[PDB]
Amino acid sequence: LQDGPEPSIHTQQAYAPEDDFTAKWTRADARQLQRMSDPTAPSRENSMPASVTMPTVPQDFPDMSNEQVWVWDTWPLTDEDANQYSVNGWEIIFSLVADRNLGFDDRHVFAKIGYFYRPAGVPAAERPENGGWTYGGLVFKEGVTGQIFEDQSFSHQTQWTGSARVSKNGEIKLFFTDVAFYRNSDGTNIKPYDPRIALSVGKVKANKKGVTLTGFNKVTDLLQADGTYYQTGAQNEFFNFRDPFTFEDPAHPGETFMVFEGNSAMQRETATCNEADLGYRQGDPYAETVDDVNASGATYQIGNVGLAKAKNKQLTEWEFLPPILSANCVTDQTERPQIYFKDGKSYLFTISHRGTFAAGLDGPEGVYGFVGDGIRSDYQPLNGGSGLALGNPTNLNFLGGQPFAPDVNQHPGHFQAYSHYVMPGGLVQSFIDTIGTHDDFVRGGTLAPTVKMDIGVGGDSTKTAVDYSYGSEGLGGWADIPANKHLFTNGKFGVAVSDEAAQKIRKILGSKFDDYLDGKPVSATVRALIEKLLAQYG
């Protein structure tokens, strides 16, 4: 470690979900990122430690849709424990997609949700190089998602990132960010954009030929920024509010929660930070003062992670709770939060950009993570108090550049991955933004290879380490989003089954089972036979 401030003291102690306690990712904590960087690291080489750095993705990569669409933020079908699902023999994922004719950086304001599917139960050695995914098309019919907005004057209307909860009958509750924009030809705002957390219910139809979705005809407006906990358009027209992830906390059975990205609810140009945001230990010769930080420009970076609680079992109404993490004077963007449970801990994982860090701070693109003894706790930022769990290869000694303009001295993998999502067993999937150098670089718009991050190394819950023996030197399969639970369902009855049971069921039963799963009527005798067999494994 290079000389610099000690990290902030955190206890990991749990509070009630309803308590007004918000953990801080402090300036002291984040300055550990500079301390971890090797200052000797020569041009275009990685300066961050290998154990918290994503293995390098090759610039020669396959495209998952054969270039039919641009693909980025992607998510599996999940249950309340974040297990990932196949339905009737098909792994299914949702992704943000855009018309491949657009410049990659114009994707955001024309984003739509589509889906991919592939056979479940295929060993890695038998899977196609590109992941073996088939593009299923768009989820929503034209015009459906605009229905929640009173002001229909929008210039752009998009579907942004969320999650998808699957029920045993193959019903899906798709949580997503429904966004209306109001812009001039030149890209400037008329009035503030309007991002909302929404739900649409639909259903999987799956047979031998493939997967189609029904429903997704109605959208329920669930949440919009409030102004007390989560910043609004009036407080800051470029406020962040997006990315719903729902789950059950083992410590609170029978409730459903949601994390999402917000911003601390301060008036943009009146925002300030205070001592706690800084978090320096008494006496530290590297401590900063509140006045200095308030001077620096850092008060414009006030990202947080929110919590909400469902007010019914249908998940159609929610209540805001106080934020669980704030990054005031640290970063603008604590994106795509999820809660991951392991060894009796709550791990909050989030992603952030290099560019969004406050003045005086810096770090790689990628996964930042926090650990604690509850979903609301005094979270301990992982790995030396830094927060860094999985950064893209980065020379922190040189400028970051941008995915559309790489710096001459920067690692060509600086923007190789984004919208990372942690899957069961610490497997991390992400999409490729840019790979290459100043004058020879390519855009991705397809998923990277899945990698493996071991969480809680050496008995120490605050430490993570990349497993470089996974796949081919740390790189697993292209777009590998594997299911660990397997639904069989006729659309009414269903069971969720393990990998091994899925295999045995598919082999034992015959074509009447294929009819059953396709929703065709069968005799009561044949049905009871099928369903009694299933029930043994659910």
Q: Which amino acid is at 315?
A: L
Q: Encoding tokens for residue 195?
A: 């991002």
Q: Check if the beta carbon of residue 477 is closer than 8 Å to that of residue 450.
A: yes
Say which residue the tokens 């789950």 belong to. 247
Instruction: State how far the Cα of 147 lies from the Cα of 198, in Å rounded to an integer.
Output: 11
CA angle 134, 136, 139 (to 5 degrees): 150
How far, CA to CA in Å, does 68 sit from each of 9, 94, 99, 139, 355? Answer: 50, 16, 8, 16, 30
DSSP per-residue string spanning 443-483: E--SB-B-EEEEESGGG-TT-EEE-TTSTBTTB--BT----
Beta bridge partners, 390, equal: 367
Is residue 183 classed as helix, strand or coil in its secondary structure?
strand
CA nearest 531: which of 486, 499, 495?
Answer: 495
Is residue 148 classed as helix, strand or coil in its secondary structure?
helix
Q: Check if the beta carbon of residue 1 is closer than 8 Å to that of residue 346.
A: no
Phi-psi region of 513 (alpha: psi -120 to 50; beta: other; left: phi over 0): alpha
Q: In a 10 Å sphere around its CB, with 0-12 CB exposed, 13-18 middle and 19+ buried, how is residue 403 labelled?
A: buried
Q: How many CB atoms lie within 10 A of CB 58?
A: 11
Give exposure, 183-210, as e/b (b: 16+ Cβ within 10 Å).
Answer: eeeeeeeeebbbbbbbbbbbbbbbbeee
Say which residue the tokens 């984004």 belong to. 418
Helix (H) or strand (E) holding 52: none
In sequence order, the 6+-apart residues with CB closer than 8 A to the CB of 417 are 54, 57, 365, 366, 392, 430, 431, 432, 433, 448
Of the residues 63, 73, 277, 288, which is catalytic? 73
Q: Encoding tokens for residue 525?
A: 């005798």
Instruction: State how far the Cα of 410 lies from the Cα of 398, in Å rounded to an integer.
Output: 6
In sequence order, the 6+-apart residues with CB closer than 8 A to the CB of 429 are 74, 420, 421, 423, 447, 448, 450, 479, 480, 481
Instruction: State how far the Cα of 76 lies from the Cα of 157, in Å rounded to an integer.
Output: 24
CA nearest 211: which of 496, 517, 524, 434?
Answer: 517
Q: In a 10 Å sphere around its CB, with 0-12 CB exposed, 13-18 middle and 19+ buried, how is residue 437 labelled?
A: middle
Q: Check if the beta carbon of residue 126 is closer than 8 Å to that of residue 477.
A: no
Instruction: State how far the Cα of 32 lies from the Cα of 47, in Å rounded to an integer.
Output: 13
Is residue 503 classed as helix, strand or coil in its secondary structure?
helix
CA angle 515, 521, 525 (to 5 degrees): 95
Q: Encoding tokens for residue 327?
A: 């990054």
Kindly compute the dihedral angle of the four CA atoms of residues 342, 343, 345, 349, in this order, to the nearest 10 degrees. Answer: -30
Q: Report resolution (Å) to 1 decimal.
A: 2.0
Kindly compute the dihedral angle of the four CA atoms of residues 29, 34, 38, 44, in this order, to the nearest 10 degrees. Answer: 130
The distance from CA 101 to its chain's CA centroid, rounded to whole angstroms, is 26
Q: Encoding tokens for residue 82?
A: 């974040």
Q: Which amino acid is at 88?
A: N
Question: Computed from CA positions of residues 464, 468, 471, 473, in that sequence, does the dihedral angle turn out positive or negative?
Answer: positive
Beta bridge partners, 496, equal: 487
Give exposure, 468-507, as e/b (b: 16+ Cβ within 10 Å).
Answer: eebbeebbbbbbbbbbebbbbbbbebbbbbeeebbeebbe
Q: In a 10 Å sphere around its CB, with 0-12 CB exposed, 13-18 middle and 19+ buried, how is residue 536 labelled?
A: exposed
Kindly compute the dihedral angle of the four CA atoms of residues 233, 234, 237, 243, in this order, to the nearest 10 degrees. Answer: -20
Per DSSP bridges, beta strands 485-489 and 464-466 are unpaired
Task: Name the experiment that determined this structure.
Answer: X-ray
Q: Encoding tokens for residue 319?
A: 């209540």
In sequence order, the 6+-apart residues with CB closer than 8 A to the CB of 289 are none
CA nearest 363: which of 8, 31, 24, 22?
Answer: 31
Q: Order of strands, edge to edge, in the sheet holding 257-263? A: 23-24, 318-328, 302-310, 257-263, 242-247
**Residue spans per domain, the chain:** 1-484, 485-538
Q: Check if the beta carbon of residue 241 is closer than 8 Å to that of residue 176.
A: no
Q: Is 515 a catalytic residue?
A: no
In sequence order, the 6+-apart residues with CB closer than 8 A to the CB of 244 are 162, 163, 175, 176, 177, 197, 222, 223, 258, 259, 260
Q: Check if the beta carbon of residue 48 is closer than 8 Å to that of residue 387.
A: no
DSSP per-residue string spanning 272-331: ---HHHH-PPTT-TT---HHHHHHHTGGG-EEEEEEEEESSTTS--EEEEEEEEEEETTB
Beta bridge partners, 309, equal: 257, 319
In sequence order, the 6+-apart residues with CB closer than 8 A to the CB of 128 are none
Instruction: State how far the Cα of 246 lies from the Cα of 254, in Å rounded to an integer.
Output: 13
Q: Encoding tokens for residue 315?
A: 């998940």
Q: How many CB atoms lie within 10 A of CB 374?
A: 20
The domain 1-484 belongs to what CATH superfamily?
Glycosyl hydrolase domain; family 43 (2.115.10.20)
Is residue 175 classed as helix, strand or coil in its secondary structure?
strand
CA angle 110, 163, 449 (to 5 degrees): 80
In sequence order, the 6+-apart residues with CB closer than 8 A to the CB of 88 are 170, 204, 206, 207, 487, 488, 489, 517
Three-state secondary structure of 207-236: CCCCEEEEECCCCEEEECCCCCCECCCCCC
DSSP per-residue string spanning 83-146: -BEEETTEEEEEEEEEETTS-GGG-GGG-EEEEEEEESS--GGGS-TT---EEEEESS-TTSGG
Q: Check if the beta carbon of residue 47 is closer than 8 Å to that of residue 397.
A: yes
Q: Check if the beta carbon of residue 369 is closer than 8 Å to that of residue 350.
A: yes
Is residue 260 classed as helix, strand or coil in its secondary structure?
strand
Q: Is 335 a catalytic residue?
A: yes
CA angle 365, 63, 46 (to 5 degrees): 30
HSE (side-chain half, CA atoms, 13 Å) at 66? 5
Question: Percent helix, strand and coil across the chain, each rounded to 5?
Answer: 15, 35, 50
Instruction: State how far the Cα of 417 lies from the Cα of 414, in Å rounded to an integer.
Output: 8
CA angle 429, 170, 223 (to 5 degrees): 70
Of the residues 335, 362, 365, 433, which is catalytic? 335
Instruction: State how far the Cα of 177 lies from the Cα of 155, in Å rounded to an integer.
Output: 17
How big is the chain, counted in residues? 538
Helix (H) or strand (E) holding 382: helix 382-385
In sequence order, the 6+-apart residues with CB closer than 8 A to the CB of 440 are none
